[PDB]
Design an enzyme around this catalytic site. Structure first.
Site, short mmCIF file in Angstrom:
data_model
loop_
_atom_site.label_atom_id
_atom_site.label_comp_id
_atom_site.label_asym_id
_atom_site.label_seq_id
_atom_site.Cartn_x
_atom_site.Cartn_y
_atom_site.Cartn_z
N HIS A 41 0.81 -1.22 0.00
CA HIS A 41 0.00 0.00 0.00
C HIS A 41 0.84 1.26 0.00
O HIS A 41 0.30 2.33 -0.27
CB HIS A 41 -0.86 0.01 1.28
N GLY A 141 -0.41 5.66 10.70
CA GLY A 141 1.03 5.54 10.68
C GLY A 141 1.53 4.18 11.08
O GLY A 141 2.74 3.93 10.97
N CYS A 143 0.92 1.19 9.78
CA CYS A 143 1.07 0.16 8.74
C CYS A 143 2.50 -0.37 8.75
O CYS A 143 3.46 0.42 8.84
CB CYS A 143 0.85 0.75 7.33
C1 LIG Z 1 -1.07 0.43 5.41
O1 LIG Z 1 -0.39 -0.60 5.16
C2 LIG Z 1 -2.47 0.47 4.77
C3 LIG Z 1 -3.29 1.60 4.88
C4 LIG Z 1 -4.56 1.61 4.32
C5 LIG Z 1 -5.03 0.46 3.63
N1 LIG Z 1 -6.19 0.20 3.00
C6 LIG Z 1 -6.18 -1.03 2.50
C7 LIG Z 1 -4.96 -1.63 2.80
C8 LIG Z 1 -4.23 -0.65 3.53
C9 LIG Z 1 -2.93 -0.67 4.09
#
Ligand SMILES: *C(=O)c1ccc2[nH]ccc2c1
Ligand SMILES: *C(=O)c1ccc2[nH]ccc2c1
Lengths: 302, 302
Positions: A41, A141, A143
């Site tokens: 992403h 933040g 992720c």
């Molecule tokens: C972060 O990895 C992330 C943020 C937003 C998203 N929406 C679908 C998959 C993601 C991953």
């Protein structure tokens, strides 16, 4: 004595956390040997139906800014593996621990190192629920934060964080980039499916409670596995198998309470409630401790 | 979203944990610069009324075996400071973080790095209770495990573990070797005194719950501080002060719920119970999150 939600010490993982920035998107990555792993992403922009193969073909190495503390790591290769990206860097992480990439089962627990901007913020325990979500604590933040277990100095990485679902629970992938559960890394109305309670874990936690001196819920009765499973179905608990009974063997022998004897206690707690009492400081039946977690933390004395 | 018992990342502390052995007693020590700190109980033998000044005069440096992983550290000096020992070693720990020795107040929280044989085992959050005990999770071998908080890469060490009291709760010292509470490092019938619930923390956790979308316990009423404190006394809660109200200011402004409005919710929960509902996954009112803990973990969006 005592019983707490206890994470593994996080130092071996902290030394692997970096920051990956592509355009105006920043998130966390995991630096092991000369590869940085992060959610794909990071190459998204202003979301509905991205074609990630196209998005990645349009990138160059110089588009990815990787920062390990105050050192920039030069990206020399990029590739996609399912829902993660692999960024090859020109420097092997000198802090790489012995590690494995494992995928975990629903009902198993792991530690989460919540990170922001490549900097670790906190550590807590999570369980993979039967519906393949986790009840984490994550803000914008987060992720690319990771989940892991540690065994004799080997880190078994099992989870990379991707997204938050509408009920506030979380979904992510293994470190091969394969999602846990029926979720996708794009914008849809996806939602967590119905969940159940992890029976073997509840029984393990009742054993923890006995080992720690809480005995008020014990009784003289023993039930059959079939009759117990009739009660489990009524209360949205998972079925108990003979393998579960076997796994609870060590705790049963340490306390001297047969597994099917404890099941009669659990049936009574489900049918009657606690009548104002608590177990291990909780007023509900806790299902996020595995038998292994109980053995790891609780006295061994029979 | 989400809310978990979240510890600080433990890596900075793991690199300070060593093993100290004197005779047949082994426990943990903390190695900062060229000093190792550990409980003075390491010089005890077969307990009732030890004179530690005599016990230490009879020791020599060579009697203390200090091991940092697989490296032995040569002891070159020894001294006592209250209930801890200071073992001067010939090597400064190259992993020493920026640190401070702080003493904490009852109602404040910290992270515990549980260790055995100088090897870290787990990390969890604890609060110092009003009666100066902690509800930890510790087994034999845990003496010298430490508690700490971290702020901008500075470790504030606040707790060294010594002993378990008869109810299973724990007691220890600050890193100057001064006990929290009316406890001593010798064999007596000492027991934890009566405890109370940390009101300001319960209110902070209700704010966490609002921020995370649990609103069922809110109501249209506002109470006075005096009238609320009458209810707190009845239910063994600590009194709420104006300083507490002020400390809750930021969370009150973020949710738009005045502190004395939330107090009317807490009064109703104390008088009525939850009627089968839960708050942040708990069926009891949780008091081991400070206002700072809630701000650290919860979204900031007003
Ligand atoms: C972060 O990895 C992330 C943020 C937003 C998203 N929406 C679908 C998959 C993601 C991953
Ligand atoms: C370890 O530090 C320890 C074990 C047993 C004790 N009894 C009184 C004080 C202690 C400390």
């Amino acid at each position: 004595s005592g019983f707490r939600k206890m994470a593994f010490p996080s130092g071996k993982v902290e030394g692997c956390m970096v920051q990956v920035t592509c355009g105006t998107t920043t998130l966390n990555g995991l630096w092991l040997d000369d590869v940085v792993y992060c959610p794909r992403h990071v190459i998204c922009t202003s979301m509905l139906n991205p074609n990630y193969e196209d998005l990645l073909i349009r990138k160059s190495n110089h588009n990815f800014l990787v920062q390990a503390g105050n050192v920039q790591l030069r990206v020399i290769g990029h590739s996609m593996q399912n829902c993660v990206l692999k960024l090859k860097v020109d420097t092997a992480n000198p802090k790489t621990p012995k590690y494995k990439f494992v995928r975990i089962q629903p009902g198993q627990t792991f530690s989460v190192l919540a990170c922001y901007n490549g900097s670790p913020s906190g550590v807590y325990q999570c369980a993979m629920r039967p519906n393949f979500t986790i009840k984490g604590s994550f803000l914008n933040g987060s992720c690319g934060s990771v989940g892991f277990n540690i065994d004799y100095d080997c880190v078994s990485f099992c989870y990379m964080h991707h997204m938050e679902l509408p009920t506030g629970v979380h979904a992510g992938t293994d470190l091969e980039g394969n999602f846990y559960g029926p979720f996708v890394d794009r914008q849809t109305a996806q939602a967590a499916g119905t969940d159940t309670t992890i029976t073997v874990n509840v029984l393990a936690w009742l054993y923890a409670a006995v080992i720690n001196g809480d005995r008020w819920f014990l009784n003289r009765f023993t039930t059959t596995l079939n009759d117990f499973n009739l009660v489990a179905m009524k209360y949205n608990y998972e079925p108990l198998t003979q393998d579960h009974v076997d796994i609870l063997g060590p705790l049963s022998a340490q306390t001297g309470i047969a597994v099917l004897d404890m099941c009669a206690s659990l049936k009574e707690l489900l049918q009657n409630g606690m009548n104002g009492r608590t177990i291990l400081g909780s007023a509900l039946l806790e299902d996020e401790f595995t038998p292994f977690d109980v053995v790891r933390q609780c006295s061994g004395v029979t």
